[PDB]
Amino acid sequence: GSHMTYPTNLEIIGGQGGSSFSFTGENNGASLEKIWVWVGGWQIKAVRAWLSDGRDETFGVPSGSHQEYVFTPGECFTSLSLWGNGAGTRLGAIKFKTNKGGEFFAHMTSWGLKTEYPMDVGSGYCLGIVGRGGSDIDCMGFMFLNAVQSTVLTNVNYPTINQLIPKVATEEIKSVSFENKTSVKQEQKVETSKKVIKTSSWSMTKSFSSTFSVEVSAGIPEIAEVSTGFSISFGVESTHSLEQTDEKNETLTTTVEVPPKKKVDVHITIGRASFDLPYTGTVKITCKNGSVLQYETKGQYKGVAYTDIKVNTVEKDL
Amino acid sequence: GSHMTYPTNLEIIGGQGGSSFSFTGENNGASLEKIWVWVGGWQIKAVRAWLSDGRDETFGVPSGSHQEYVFTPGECFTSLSLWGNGAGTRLGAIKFKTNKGGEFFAHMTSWGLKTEYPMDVGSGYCLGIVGRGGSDIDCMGFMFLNAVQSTVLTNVNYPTINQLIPKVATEEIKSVSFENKTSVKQEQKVETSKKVIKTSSWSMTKSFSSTFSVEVSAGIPEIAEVSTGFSISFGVESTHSLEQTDEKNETLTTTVEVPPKKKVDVHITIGRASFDLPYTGTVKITCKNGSVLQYETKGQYKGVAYTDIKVNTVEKDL
Numbered sequence A, B: 001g002s003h004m005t006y007p008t009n010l011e012i013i014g015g016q017g018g019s020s021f022s023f024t025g026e027n028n029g030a031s032l033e034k035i036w037v038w039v040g041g042w043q044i045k046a047v048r049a050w051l052s053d054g055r056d057e058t059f060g061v062p063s064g065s066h067q068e069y070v071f072t073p074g075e076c077f078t079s080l081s082l083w084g085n086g087a088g089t090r091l092g093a094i095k096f097k098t099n100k101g102g103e104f105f106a107h108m109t110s111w112g113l114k115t116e117y118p119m120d121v122g123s124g125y126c127l128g129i130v131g132r133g134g135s136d137i138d139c140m141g142f143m144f145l146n147a148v149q150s151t152v153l154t155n156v157n158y159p160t161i162n163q164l165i166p167k168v169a170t171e172e173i174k175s176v177s178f179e180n181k182t183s184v185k186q187e188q189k190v191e192t193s194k195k196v197i198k199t200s201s202w203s204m205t206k207s208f209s210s211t212f213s214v215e216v217s218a219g220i221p222e223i224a225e226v227s228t229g230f231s232i233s234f235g236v237e238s239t240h241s242l243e244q245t246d247e248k249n250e251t252l253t254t255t256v257e258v259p260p261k262k263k264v265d266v267h268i269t270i271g272r273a274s275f276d277l278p279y280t281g282t283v284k285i286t287c288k289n290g291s292v293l294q295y296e297t298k299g300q301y302k303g304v305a306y307t308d309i310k311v312n313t314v315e316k317d318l
């Protein structure tokens, strides 16, 4: 009585003729984006499906006109029922409703419908379809991702980061001038504050990111001003959102030495850098039922990062 | 030997004639938004200033054309110098630069400029002007907020929240049906997941919020479904940003009981509420130098909140 749970939920209805097919995003997180259904008198005749990664395949042999459903990003199933043709030999009908208020019903046209099979749609996120086709749709089911506990983008790498030479724009914060009339050392306290807005963005297919709250477990590219240039350090690992912004009041206290019979000009600045670079990582979906679905992904990271506040003092003799 | 610090920085240059004026946002965080300067042969003739709260005053008596500087939100001074008229009886010139690359220089037209007085602009955020005027500008200084350590919106109240009746819109997450053909009670586990995006925002004058990173210490309006109806409670105080979004995967596991020889329909939903109400609070500015500037404020809070996920089951015979 060992019990197995799975990250997907799939119930296939119909007969056992035809040849098996499996058309799902279960290895890359792709979802069902569009479906065309053709019907006959005593069967679903054919199905054409488009997944959000651009795959497009037809099962069975179309005849007549089709019915269409176009799913928008974030649109999930709220319910699904399938019918066989009543004889156990073909799929007979598909009915569903979505979380955007849509409803779709496609059914054989001659024979009356018999036993309805209502399905659990899991999370509501449909990964595609699986079944058997020949001239017709012998059998089919819709594959759903089961309800999700967490969705994490982890194992993030930036494979061009070491090659990259970042452009650091200087922002002026303040300049102050002092003059020391006396023949003895002077010291001046200078306090600086400046609002900095650091941002991080990891791109993601919009279907997946509209449906799930993706946490990011990653290091953030950072800038420090090295004496021989600017290097993009790949910082310490922590948790973020896919689009993240962190504001603060960056501050510094400087004690400026003003020698005798000298004027000192103090110039206070900060450096700003925009990263725009590829990343790779692993999407890890953990379902409520304990199972996991993971897959490798790649995208673009965009970052805005700042140096420390910099103080430059220029001494002159008046 | 005690040491006294202050949250504003103000150095007044010129003579002692005329009458005192003080035109600053040091009681409501308003900043200098626009300035017009008129000059004469041996003086600054007049200054007209506009603060970000809509105040507008003129000091001295204009003659001739004016020079103008218009400050955009977030534009701070990076440097400032003032001159007297050389005789110590009038302000004679104003020169400044800003963090958006601007520069402005207004000076008396006949008498030569003597001693330049360079000023520490503090945070760069100019609260306004203080000085003496009669026919002319006898003396003036620009007041700055000193470098800032933190800016916090706290003591937040929503004085209409008790009168409020909230619009709750119901979103469908999933529905499923079960059938029990036995004369024996049956159980079914249904797991649910749903992405929710909760948002908070407290309005603030754009000049202040563009210059400073404002942390919010507040309770957030929250919504629960009571057996009677829909509660709107304050929440417990915590730290937020002025514009805050929090995504999560809300989840639920439900054990559904199917009584013998019954159909049971399970309808899983969540309630969404939009708040749009007034708030009051206290802005607390703590300077690097330990001093504090506090003032009361008011604005509009906008929120999106959600109830817990709800399960409603209905039963029939079959």
Ligand SMILES: OC[C@H]1O[C@@](CO)(O[C@H]2O[C@H](CO)[C@@H](O)[C@H](O)[C@H]2O)[C@@H](O)[C@@H]1O
Binding pocket: A016, A017, A018, A019, A133, A134, A135, A136, A137, A138
């Ligand atoms: O009804 C379709 C028609 O086609 C045939 C033979 O070409 O069978 C093909 O299609 C069936 C439905 O997809 C499959 O079950 C079968 O395996 C496949 O050869 C006829 O047998 C059938 O009547």
Ligand SMILES: OC[C@H]1O[C@@](CO)(O[C@H]2O[C@H](CO)[C@@H](O)[C@H](O)[C@H]2O)[C@@H](O)[C@@H]1O
Binding pocket: B016, B017, B018, B019, B133, B134, B135, B136, B137, B138
């Ligand atoms: O500066 C012009 C002229 O104004 C007079 C009055 O005619 O003085 C007024 O303006 C001065 C500059 O603002 C003030 O110092 C003075 O207090 C005020 O009465 C003249 O004295 C002066 O020459």
Ligand SMILES: [Cl-]
Binding pocket: A014, A083, A084, A085, A086, A087, A088, A089, A090
């Ligand atoms: Cl059947």
Ligand SMILES: [Cl-]
Binding pocket: B014, B083, B084, B085, B086, B087, B088, B089
């Ligand atoms: Cl002078």
